[PDB]
Structure 1
Amino acid sequence: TTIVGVKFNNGVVIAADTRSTQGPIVADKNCAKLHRISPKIWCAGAGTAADTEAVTQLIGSNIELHSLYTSREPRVVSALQMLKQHLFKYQGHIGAYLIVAGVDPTGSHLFSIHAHGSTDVGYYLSLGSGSLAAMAVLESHWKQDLTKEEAIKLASDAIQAGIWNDLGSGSNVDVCVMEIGKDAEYLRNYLTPNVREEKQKSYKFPRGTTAVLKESIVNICDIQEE
């Protein structure tokens, strides 16, 4: 997994690859690692995939109820505080490593969180097995006062570094841009640089190739009238 977050002029961008693995095997080639906590607060997760979604949905659910209770749009610091306290209580056993980003009435924010409950603040961050490849690109090309177009370019370049150089990461680049005073735009499969080439041969079988013992209609309908 490679995930990054980059601050820019009027907001923040997060990005991620789309490969999920079971040891050395690729379970899903087009995984969605950018999760929504609230409309304008999004986070990307690395580590135990069930933990990163479970913890994102629980906090996202409680954030929604909090937003309704207070009649205010949710804040990133609220999501951060609720995530870290939950993760600290479970002493690292919930293996969620998150980059939390968003915009709220206070402004634009970017934090990382780690399974034990440490949090950090940054203009650029990376997490996952491909974080060192991504951080190399970020440390080479990051500057202050980036534009929106520059930040998307930098973020996707950092994910590409993870895709090509880290075996844990691969396939496509997902992006989500959160700008102040605008709707958050989720760009699913922003880059697609890993389409499989056409195969040499068709493996469609002649009908009747497989040996069959018994055939029967399965009753999926309910008990019938009359």
Structure 2
Amino acid sequence: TIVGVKFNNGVVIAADTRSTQGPIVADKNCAKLHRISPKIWCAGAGTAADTEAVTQLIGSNIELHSLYTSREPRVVSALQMLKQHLFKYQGHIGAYLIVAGVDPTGSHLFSIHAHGSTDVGYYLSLGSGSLAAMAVLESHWKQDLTKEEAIKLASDAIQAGIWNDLGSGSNVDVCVMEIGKDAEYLRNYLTPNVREEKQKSYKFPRGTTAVLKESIVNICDIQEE
């Protein structure tokens, strides 16, 4: 579950932290909020390796572009580079992204589909929990939101996904990008899913496991003398 919400003087994005292989949870605290440039962040859904790799590639090229032009990177540049890359691979790179950021032009919020389509909006949601999140956004979004109202709306939308969608869960990450300020990345902004204490300790008595051989492993280099 990933969302993007525009507000008065900027934009905010948020995401859950669950990573799954089929019905299994591989990572309970995955970081879905990526940095393309200092003030341009994206949230990714779909094939995890694809969203990371496509984010790093365009982030690398954006850095080099920023150095070449002596200018701060723009969101439309990252948007254009991403969609052209994804379009070229005809959807085989399963990256679904919400791209947001601030630049000399202002604040921006876009979504990117794996086939190369882009959309503009004041509020967006992607992933398996996008419907649960969008229901919240459609119910509570309004024009002229404050920074504090937008963070609340965004995290509420992610919570809808966490509770109601099985593909989403665990914690809530946030990143706020306000105009004329440094972007603040709020890792684990919310932690409403802490595991309760176990009833028992499963620490074993030393010697419980049967062993056949022991040996020291030489990790060091070849020695002198």
Superposed CA offset, 1:133-177 (max 9, x none): 000000000000000000000000000000000000000000000
Secondary structure at the residue paired with 2:81? helix
Whole-angstrom CA distance in 2 between matches of 1:199 and 1:77: 49
Whole-angstrom CA distance in 1 between matches of 2:119 and 2:18: 26
Secondary structure at the residue paired with 2:77? helix
Superposed CA offset, 1:92-139 (max 9, x none): 000000000000000000000000000000000000000000000000
Superposed CA offset, 1:11-43 (max 9, x none): 000000000000000000000000000000000
Secondary structure at the residue paired with 2:44? strand
Q: Shift of residue 72 of structure 1?
A: 0.1
Corresponding pairs, count = 225
Secondary structure at the residue paired with 1:51? helix
Whole-angstrom CA distance in 2 between matches of 1:158 and 1:222: 54
Question: CA RMSD for the aligned pairs?
Answer: 0.2
TM-score, scaled to structure 2: 1.00
Whole-angstrom CA distance in 1 between matches of 2:195 and 2:59: 36
Whole-angstrom CA distance in 2 between matches of 1:95 and 1:202: 42
Whole-angstrom CA distance in 2 between matches of 1:183 and 1:36: 13
TM-score, scaled to structure 1: 0.99
Whole-angstrom CA distance in 1 between matches of 2:93 and 2:133: 24
2:56 matched residue in structure 1: 57
Secondary structure at the residue paired with 1:102? strand
1:94 matched residue in structure 2: 93
Whole-angstrom CA distance in 1 between matches of 2:153 and 2:29: 21
Q: Shift of residue 224 of structure 1?
A: 0.2
Secondary structure at the residue paired with 2:134? helix
Secondary structure at the residue paired with 1:129? coil
Whole-angstrom CA distance in 2 between matches of 1:192 and 1:29: 11
Whole-angstrom CA distance in 2 between matches of 1:84 and 1:18: 25
Q: Shift of residue 196 of structure 1?
A: 0.3
Identity %: 100
Whole-angstrom CA distance in 2 between matches of 1:115 and 1:91: 8
Q: Which portions of structure 1, spanning 4 or more consecutive aligned residues, are displaced by more than 3 angstroms?
A: none
Q: Shift of residue 71 of structure 1?
A: 0.1
Secondary structure at the residue paired with 1:206? coil
User: Could you list the runs of 5+ residues in structure 2 that have no partner in the other structure?
Assistant: none
1:22 matched residue in structure 2: 21
Q: Shift of residue 4 of structure 1?
A: 0.1
Whole-angstrom CA distance in 2 between matches of 1:20 and 1:194: 15
Whole-angstrom CA distance in 1 between matches of 2:218 and 2:153: 55
User: Could you list the runs of 5+ residues in structure 1 that have no partner in the other structure?
Assistant: none
Whole-angstrom CA distance in 2 between matches of 1:41 and 1:70: 17
Whole-angstrom CA distance in 2 between matches of 1:194 and 1:142: 26
Whole-angstrom CA distance in 1 between matches of 2:79 and 2:29: 27
Superposed CA offset, 1:51-86 (max 9, x none): 000000000000000000000000000000000000
